[model samples]
Target: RICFNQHSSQPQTTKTCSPGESSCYHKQWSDFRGTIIERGCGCPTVKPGIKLSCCESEVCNN
Candidate 1:
């Protein structure tokens, strides 16, 4: 499936997940500069105060 992928605070890009990567994730946290957002095609581990969400759908991470 397709999901959004981005590291910096900018417009996101789309990517088709490979085999065994069926989940889409969106993670957010706060820092000195501002809020940080990360999105990708997988389920990842998270820490406290970090918002992490996974979904199964086309471009669901957006």
Candidate 2:
């Protein structure tokens, strides 16, 4: 599947998942700069207090 891959300082881009990566995720956290967002092609562990959303379809993480 495909997903939106993004970082706090970069523009949004598309990512094609690896064969074994079946999930995509959207995560948010707070810092001095305020809430930060990250999106990627796999469901990774997030630190406590971070918000996470996971999806199973192409571009669904967006």
Candidate 3:
């Protein structure tokens, strides 16, 4: 008799607004049903609003 089971591979991260002067947009609002998914842009990062991530061997924030 033999039995084996394992589980791994759950990497997820979002709150992506990196360097935004006019970019960094992924805000959504739905009424009954809706969608508006925009990602980050460039030319602005002079303050705060941060949450970075790394896993599966780790490599981010370069």
Candidate 4:
């Protein structure tokens, strides 16, 4: 399985994979106030092979 996240301010999309063989995609939107405007995930796996999960953080002052 795989996980992905997208930044609202940026066009860059982050992705991560879990154990086994699986793929996934996601898109996220955030506001200038450091808040997540929208978020979604897409799992492209047909059978249950592996489990994957991911998330995007809208706020990162560091």
Candidate 5:
């Protein structure tokens, strides 16, 4: 999963992938600038937060 504010000052945009998938990850927060917050990994159905990366934008990817 990836969430980012390309404009830097605007709300973040998010992208998510299914379990065991891979994709680019990025994010931006009020206190932080654009940055890679996570990477792709195997998804877990039992525990979504376990293998998946959850961000403030509610985006998740594994």
Candidate 6:
């Protein structure tokens, strides 16, 4: 499962942020201090507040 903070017009939507794969849009807006799936690769996953990598032997920032 993945943590997803779906979009909302309210101040805090992640208060009850749930875990569901791609349950929320993979994009986010900056006007508000909220977040969503930023990006994914190779594994086809999406979730907010997370950075992931796969199939690589070396470590680097994504």
Report lDDT (CA) for all predictions. 0.84, 0.84, 0.25, 0.36, 0.35, 0.31
RMSD of each predicted structure:
1.6, 1.8, 14.9, 11.6, 9.3, 10.6
- Lowest-scoring 10 consecutive residues by lDDT in candidate 5? 40-49
Clashing pairs in 3: 20-44
Model 4 regions more than 4 Å off? 1-4, 8-11, 27-62
TM-score rank, highest first? 2, 1, 4, 5, 3, 6
Clashes of each: 0, 0, 1, 0, 2, 0
Q: What is the TM-score of each candidate against the true structure?
A: 0.82, 0.83, 0.19, 0.26, 0.21, 0.18
Weakest lDDT window of 10 consecutive positions for candidate 6: 53-62
What is the model-wide C-alpha lDDT for candidate 5?
A: 0.35
Candidate 2 residue 11 C-alpha distance from true site, Å: 3.4
Which runs in model 3 stand beyond 4 Å of their true positions?
1-22, 34-62
10 residues in a row with least lDDT, candidate 1? 6-15
lDDT of 4 at 27: 30
lDDT of 2 by residue, 1-62 (tens): 89888776477798887988889998988878788789898777877987898989888877
Find the number of clashing residue pairs for candidate 2. Answer: 0
Candidate 6, 1-56: lDDT as tens digits: 22223333333233222334323223433436644333221333534634443332
Off by over 4 Å in 1: 7-9
TM-score of 2: 0.83
Better of 1 and 4 by TM-score: 1
